[PDB]
Amino acid sequence: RVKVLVLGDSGVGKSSLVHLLCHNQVLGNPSWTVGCSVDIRVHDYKEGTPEEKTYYIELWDVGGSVGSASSVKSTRAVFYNSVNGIILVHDLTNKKSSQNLYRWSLEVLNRFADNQIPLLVIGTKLDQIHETKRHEVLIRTAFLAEDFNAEEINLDCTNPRSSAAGSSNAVKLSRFFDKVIEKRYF
Amino acid sequence: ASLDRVKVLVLGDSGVGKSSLVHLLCHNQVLGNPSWTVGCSVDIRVHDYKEGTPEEKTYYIELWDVGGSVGSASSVKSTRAVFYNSVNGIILVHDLTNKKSSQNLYRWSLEVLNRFADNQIPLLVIGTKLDQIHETKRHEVLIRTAFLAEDFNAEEINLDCTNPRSSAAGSSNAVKLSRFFDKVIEKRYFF
Ligand SMILES: Nc1nc2c(ncn2[C@@H]2O[C@H](COP(=O)(O)OP(=O)(O)O)[C@@H](O)[C@H]2O)c(=O)[nH]1
Ligand SMILES: Nc1nc2c(ncn2[C@@H]2O[C@H](COP(=O)(O)OP(=O)(O)O)[C@@H](O)[C@H]2O)c(=O)[nH]1
Ligand SMILES: [Mg+2]
Ligand SMILES: [Mg+2]
């Protein structure tokens, strides 16, 4: 059993990301996610090796807003227990959504050098960043990932090549999930 | 307060009242604007095991509303099946005005318990829309659901999910619900 929280502002592409991570295909008709949605990634630990083993990784998309009232956040807090990894999702076209990752992470880790829970920062809508602005956008997200002591992936969740097997993105994703499993069990 | 995870599946046909039931069980209020549930929805019931005794211990019980249809294609049920692992209890939900939804509970249970005397996972059968049953016919409906619940070796609760008093503390419903969750916890942790 493995529980990975998927955190981020509404509209950044969480449901699309989760769908790609669990089904290797693009989420075609994303609807507004009500409540906590859970999808399972059938994950090959140490993929491609003779010690390959299957784990069911639960991706918990709990939802909500960092601008919610205190009482709303307290009810959300019961979902943040027994967490084995966290994916922090931001929309690369919306600087507000990456800033809000600091609020999201504090909600969990207080209700970063000392944090032992593996973290992964994912920027979505990379396709929407003009080549003109890519250097500036990505320099900032590097600072973001370092603050969390986290690896970073930037991708287009609506392009199935984003996580194609053997791609650089797919390799980093497998490394993160293997680290989640290792810190939980080994 | 306990970091120990407890997983209870909530199974039943679309439209029987799963989301309304779960909302009442987790939020102590009626679900006012039920929408069509997409994919797997999870909510948490904070449960005091052996409440009121010196062994009282709080557990977070996850209610997993996985969804789908017993008529889905083989490939759909195969992907759904990965949601049925590490299960500590099952709530089987049927709509008391819809006899087909009760019959389909046999299919739902087979989907899980293949991926009833020998089953070790605690089961609870919950019939909804009791308010929609004519008072004349309530006795007849409840005789039938009693036999249904016996087939599953399960306790049964019948209620109106839109009446918040259905889960009133100390009521017959609340006692049976606590007994079920205590057995779920006991079979996982104190067995
Ligand atoms: N162009 C583009 N659109 C995206 C990307 N990721 C998500 N979307 C779109 O952004 C909208 C919000 O995505 P959704 O997954 O529902 O976001 P959520 O509210 O965080 O779960 C949807 O219309 C998606 O199709 C991406 O990488 N590129
Ligand atoms: N009168 C009555 N209506 C109910 C009851 N349970 C559910 N409903 C209604 O039945 C419809 C379907 O309920 P819902 O919770 O969405 O079912 P689901 O598809 O199983 O999640 C909704 O309009 C509910 O308001 C009940 O016990 N009594
Ligand atoms: Mg969503
Ligand atoms: Mg529903």
Three-state secondary structure readout of A48-98: CCCCCEEEEEEEEECCCCCCCCHHHHHHHHHHHCCCCEEEEEEECCCHHHH
A103 Cα: distance to centroid of ligand 2 (angstroms): 36
**Bridge partners of residue B44, in order along the sequence:** B62
- Check if A154 has its Cβ closer than 6 Å to any atom of ligand 1: no
Q: Which residues of A touch B60 (CB under 8 A)?
A: 78, 81
Q: Sort strands B57-65 and B5-11 into parallel, antiparallel or unpaired.
A: parallel
Between CA B54 and CA B5 the distance in angstroms is 21
**Radius of gyration of chain A, Cα coordinates, nearest whole angstrom:** 16
B67: phi then psi, degrees, rounded to nearest 5 = 80, -170
- Structure token digits, residue A156: 């287009």
Closest CA to A184 of A115, A118, A121, A111: A118
Q: Sort strands A36-45 and A53-61 into parallel, antiparallel or unpaired.
A: antiparallel
Between CA A38 and CA B32 the distance in angstroms is 23
Between CA B164 and CA A15 the distance in angstroms is 32
Nearest residue (by CA) to ligand 2, atom 22, is B34
Q: Do B40 and A39 lie within an 8 Å CB cutoff?
A: yes
Closest CA to A135 of A91, A92, A87, A90: A92
Count the Cβ atoms, other than its own, within 10 Å of residue B147: 8
Tell me which method was used to determine the 3D structure: X-ray
Residue found under tokens 């996985």: B66
Nearest residue (by CA) to ligand 2, atom 26, is B129
Q: Which residues of A touch B83 (CB under 8 A)?
A: 40
Instruction: Tell me, in Å, the resolution of the deposited structure.
Output: 2.0
Between CA A153 and CA A141 the distance in angstroms is 10
Burial of B113 (0-12, 13-18, 19+ CB in 10 A): middle
Count the Cβ atoms, other than its own, within 10 Å of residue A83: 17
Of the candidates B41, B46, B86, the beta carbon closest to that of A36 is on B41
A89 Cα nearest atom in ligand 1: 20
A145: phi then psi, degrees, rounded to nearest 5 = -65, -35
SS3 call for A170: helix
Pick from B10, B31, B40, B188 the residue to mutate for testing the A interface (most A CBs within 10 Å): B40
A97 Cα: distance to centroid of ligand 3 (angstroms): 14
SS3 call for A166: coil
Q: Sort strands B40-49 and A119-124 into parallel, antiparallel or unpaired.
A: unpaired
Of the candidates A37, A56, A78, the beta carbon closest to that of B44 is on A78
Closest CA to B90 of B72, B70, B108, B68: B108
Between CA A91 and CA A179 the distance in angstroms is 25
Q: Do A81 and B3 lie within an 8 Å CB cutoff?
A: yes
What is the helix, strand, coil percentage profile of chain A, to 5?
40, 25, 35
- Structure token digits, residue B171: 């009521």
